[PDB]
Amino acid sequence: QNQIVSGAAWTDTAGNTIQAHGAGILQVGSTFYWFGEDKSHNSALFKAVSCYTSSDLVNWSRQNDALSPIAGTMISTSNVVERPKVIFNQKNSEYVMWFHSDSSNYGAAMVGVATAKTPCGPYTYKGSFKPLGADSRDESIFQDDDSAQTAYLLYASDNNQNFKISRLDANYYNVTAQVSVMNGATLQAPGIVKHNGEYFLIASHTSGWAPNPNKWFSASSLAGPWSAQQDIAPSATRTWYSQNAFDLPLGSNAIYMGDRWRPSLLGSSRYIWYPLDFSSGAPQIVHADVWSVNVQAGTYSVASGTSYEAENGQRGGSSTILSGSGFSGGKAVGYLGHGGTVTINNVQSNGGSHWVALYFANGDSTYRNVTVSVNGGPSVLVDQPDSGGGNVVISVPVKLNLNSGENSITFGSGQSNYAADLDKIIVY
Ligand SMILES: *[C@@H]1O[C@H](CO)[C@@H](O[C@@H]2O[C@H](CO)[C@@H](O[C@@H]3O[C@H](CO)[C@@H](O)[C@H](O)[C@@H]3O)[C@H](O)[C@H]2NC(C)=O)[C@H](O)[C@H]1NC(C)=O
Ligand SMILES: OC[C@H]1O[C@@H](O[C@H]2[C@@H](O)[C@@H](CO)O[C@@H](O[C@@H]3[C@@H](O)[C@H](O)O[C@H](CO)[C@@H]3O)[C@@H]2O)[C@H](O)[C@@H](O)[C@H]1O
Ligand SMILES: *[C@@H]1O[C@H](CO)[C@@H](O)[C@H](O)[C@H]1NC(C)=O
Ligand SMILES: *[C@@H]1O[C@H](CO)[C@@H](O)[C@H](O)[C@H]1NC(C)=O
Ligand SMILES: OC[C@H]1O[C@@H](O)[C@H](O)[C@@H](O)[C@H]1O
Ligand SMILES: [Ca+2]
């Protein structure tokens, strides 16, 4: 049944908001382990490397925290611990965790290591350092599938200007040699997945918390040469408002796992997971608002839903129709909220709880929100991130309770702040 619904608030088996940002994924046997920053405290300072497990990548269960602060050290609560990655060391039968270990102004620019014999740990800190003497901020660990299972650190170096790939020693404890450097790449948030014997690097450019168009690069060796940057998503959408975290191989394709960073409320940062489809020979995000993964078969199924054009709705109050090449049908409804509404009618449904995808444009740099009322019911307030332009449409999901047969859905009523411009909705 379960569904990967990007943008919705995800909850563990305990009903608590998952707090595993900067995802790192490890698969011991039939269990998946998801590692991330715990951001419960709405701050970038360190609180925990969390630990969640699952058997099918949707139903997650929060274990003990795999790494926890230590006062007077550099994994203390005055420091920063980002993007935990974990591979398994066959030789030592040992789980080695890498992370970006830094100071609160990111001037320290180090890696940190920790080990444990249990996948979810807890892990003991072995210390932090500059890899081969150089800056390391955003990083990732690639485990090759050669016989030695050689591991590589991927990291943004020299104040994020030069992207580097270096080989890990046979213990995964330190870096033995450089392999590759892209000078002036200003790449961060890296991941690598190996597909058809070719290495694909995925990475953001550097733009603070602001999402930018993430890029793919390929090479037949980790040393290179690497292809020039290409898009994994439509450029205007800024990776569908997200930033790469982990790229997990899945059958003959992969899953793109990104974070939607909310700097002003970091705990509430969302998880953006999409099929990464290689049918063209290269990774492309499949913009699936709702989709399912069958891990055992390495397949994904993209749920198909029904589109309703916001402009075919019934406007109320001071809402308007707007025109733009970014809108589906060429139109959207503006001036929603602050006295303007639109009701979408004859939304057909077998009844129950249905994921509905609100397609909108938000030209501001800050969040808006919209009220959503089904058949005159009490409204839920749905968040609307900055979209990248009044002509750029991304989508957020809201789970709604419909009746069998004909429903209505009302946007913008009972809110004094303007909402974002509604392009359409897709009822799954
Ligand atoms: C729903 O979206 C609206 C905007 O679309 C959000 O309203 C904005 O809300 C913020 C925070 O509540 C307001 O901020 C503050 O303004 C006061 C003085 O006005 C200032 O002293 C504070 O430092 C802060 O900046 C902001 O005025 C408001 N802007 C607009 C245009 O409405 C609202 O917060 C969202 N609601 C939810 C539940 O997320
Ligand atoms: O804001 C913190 C947050 O955002 C990301 O990245 C930023 C930081 O890693 C930061 C560290 O100094 O560097 C940003 O990059 C600029 C660089 O692009 C510019 O040209 O020069 C300055 C030199 O001071 C700086 O290096 C980067 O955007 C991370 O993705 C996220 O995890 C978190 O750290
Ligand atoms: C976990 O989610 C999966 C959906 O694929 C399913 O087994 C069920 O809904 C959940 N199981 C439990 C025990 O909560
Ligand atoms: C790795 O080597 C660095 C030198 O850059 C050193 O500072 C650090 O302590 C070493 N750590 C381990 C675990 O070998
Ligand atoms: O500020 C009020 C207006 O702002 C515009 O940017 C938006 O496209 C309109 O639909 C309306 O919301
Ligand atoms: Ca439209």
For residues 281 and 377, membership in a common domain is answered with no
For strand 331-334 and strand 320-323, is the pairing parallel, antiparallel, or unpaired?
A: antiparallel
Alpha-carbon distances of 413 from 23, 142, 320, 358, 380, rounded to whole Å: 37, 49, 14, 16, 11
* Rg (alpha carbons) of the chain, rounded to whole number: 22
Q: Which of 269, 284, 302 is the last residue of a domain?
A: 302
CB–CB of 428/289 below 8 Å? yes
Write the CA distances from 137 to 24, 161, 183, integer angstroms: 16, 11, 15
CA distances from 158 to 129, 155, 176 (A): 14, 10, 19
CATH code of the domain in which 252 resides: 2.115.10.20
Does the beta carbon of 306 lie inside 6 Å of ligand 3?
Answer: no
Are 310 and 168 members of one domain? no
Ramachandran angles phi, psi of 312, nearest 5°? -85, -5
Q: Which ligand is nearest to the CA of 54?
A: 3
The residue among 277, 302, 327 that closes a domain is: 302
Ion ligand 6: residues, CB within 5 A, are 309, 327-329, 331, 423-424
- Structural determination approach: X-ray
Which positions ≥6 away from 378 have C-beta within 8 Å?
none
Determine the structural domain holding residue 76 and report its residue range.
4-302
Q: How far is CA 396 from the centre of its chain?
A: 14
Q: What whole-number distance in Å separates Cα of residue 258 and Cα of residue 274?
A: 9
Q: Give resolution in angstroms.
A: 2.5
- Number of folded domains in the chain? 2
Q: Which positions ≥6 away from 157 have C-beta within 8 Å?
A: 134, 135, 136, 137, 163, 164, 181
Taking the CA atoms of 310, 312, 317 and 320 in sequence, report the sign of the dihedral they define. positive
Tell me the CA–centroid distance for residue 367 and ligand 1, in Å: 9
Are the C-beta atoms of residues 200 and 216 closer than 8 Å to each other?
A: yes
Q: What is the whole-number distance in angstroms between the Cα of residue 417 and the centre of ligand 1?
A: 9
Q: 320 and 211 share a domain?
A: no
The CA–CA distances, whole Å, from 111 to 45, 108, 119, 187, 273 equal 16, 9, 20, 17, 26
Among protein residues, the one whose CA lies closest to atom 12 of ligand 5: 335
Q: Are residues 213 and 348 in the same domain?
A: no
Query: How far apart are alpha carbons 58 and 2 in whole angstroms?
Result: 7
Domain termination residue (choose one: 302, 320, 339):
302
